[PDB]
Design a protein around this ligand. Structure first.
Ligand SMILES: CN(C)[C@H]1CN([C@H]2CCc3cccc(F)c32)C[C@@H]1c1ccc(N2CCN(S(C)(=O)=O)CC2)cc1
Length: 359
């Protein structure tokens, strides 16, 4: 990769999130969103490294701090949608064409640290919160499907979560040092999702009942020894990080144990590898993968990017390269690959945005 451009947003506050729109249409330029301060901004990538500024949504509350965003599309029209959330605990669904807010969701109103859309269902939105819970929403019927919590759930802020390939299960992580698995292909959760689609408050008297899921299907505190701030599935394996200068590749159970036969009492984990790096020992730094899961990127606290090629026979064989620029010195909170991995964008604590193009 080579650095082709950079810019700084006028608010001078940390950029906490960046996401390419992997649903952008054939023959349209590549578009990414950034979140920081109380705003979300869209940019288009053009030739000669140009990053073209489009339009922002600015929250009416000056004390809102957006922490996360996620792209989906309208399941009836195919038009793109953007979900954003942060410190106020309000999920906003934004029309990215006009940047109008279309609607919003409040849970209990505590900070939301990450949003993720289900990989097969564009209406199913997962939020993770400072209140120790995850929430699954159906943004077609405007229903809260389920809350994942209880004393056997997380015991401090939830910082990240990820759906597996088919969206049959979720792995979550946070400040309690634990990683927890939640199956959403149980008969109970499949029924709840079905009921959420059948719910129309204009045609019934009942409120929609949300499931309370109080028991994860697996839990470990044996991977990391500090806050776990990012997690992603790699097939049936997990990649996760803390602030110990490492991304760990691991799985529940013993080497030969099938993920779908793991019982909630499983006490073992298997470590398949670990990707070390330097100067990323502050809390709240995310890694990202490309659409095909061929590539992994992480930025560190002094502006260096690490990129791993995962197109190798076993996880521990991943090939690392590093990307530095003499003017890029601030902490990189998140990266995003374009769908094809031709562009990598990094965003920073000084409101700076860095574009790297594949050679
Ligand atoms: C748990 N809460 C408190 C965090 C979570 N984090 C989110 C968004 C980024 C990220 C990455 C991984 C996991 C996450 F949950 C999150 C949002 C919250 C937060 C608040 C303030 C800051 N600081 C930035 C750096 N500066 S500065 C540039 O020195 O002014 C001082 C504020 C850092 C993070």
């Amino acid at each position: 990769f080579k650095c082709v451009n950079s810019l700084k947003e006028d608010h001078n506050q940390p950029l906490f999130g960046v996401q390419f729109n992997w649903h952008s249409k054939e023959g349209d330029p590549l578009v990414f969103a950034t979140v920081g301060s109380n705003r979300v901004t869209l940019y288009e990538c053009h030739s000669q490294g140009e990053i073209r500024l489009l339009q922002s949504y600015v929250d009416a509350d000056a004390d809102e701090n957006f922490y996360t965003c996620a792209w989906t599309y309208d399941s009836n029209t195919s038009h793109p949608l953007l979900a954003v959330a942060g410190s106020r605990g309000i999920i906003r669904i934004i029309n990215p064409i006009t940047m109008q807010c279309i609607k919003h969701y409040v849970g209990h109103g505590n900070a939301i640290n990450e949003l993720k859309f289900h990989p097969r269902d564009p209406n199913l939105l997962l939020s993770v919160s400072k209140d120790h819970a995850l929430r699954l929403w159906n943004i077609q019927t405007d229903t809260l499907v389920a809350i994942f919590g209880g004393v056997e759930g997380h015991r401090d802020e939830v910082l990240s979560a990820d759906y597996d390939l088919l969206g049959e299960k979720i792995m979550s992580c946070g400040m309690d040092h634990s990683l927890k698995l939640w199956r959403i292909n149980s008969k109970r959760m499949m029924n709840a999702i079905k009921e959420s689609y059948d719910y129309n408050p204009n045609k019934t008297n009942r409120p929609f009942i949300s499931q309370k899921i109080h028991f994860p299907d697996f839990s470990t505190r044996d991977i990391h020894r500090n806050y776990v701030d990012c997690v992603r599935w790699l097939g049936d394996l997990i990649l996760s990080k803390s602030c110990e200068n490492a991304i760990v590749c691991w799985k529940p159970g013993k080497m030969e144990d099938d993920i779908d036969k793991i019982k909630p009492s499983e006490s073992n984990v298997t470590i398949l590898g670990r990707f070390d790096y330097s100067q990323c020992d502050i809390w709240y730094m995310r890694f990202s993968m490309d659409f095909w899961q061929k590539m992994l990127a992480l930025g560190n606290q002094v502006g260096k990017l690490y990129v791993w090629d995962l197109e190798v026979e076993d996880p521990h064989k991943a090939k690392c390269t590093t990307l530095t620029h003499h003017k890029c010195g601030a902490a990189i909170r998140q990266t995003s690959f374009s769908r094809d991995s031709s562009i990598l964008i990094a965003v920073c604590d000084d409101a700076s945005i860095w574009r790297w193009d594949r050679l």
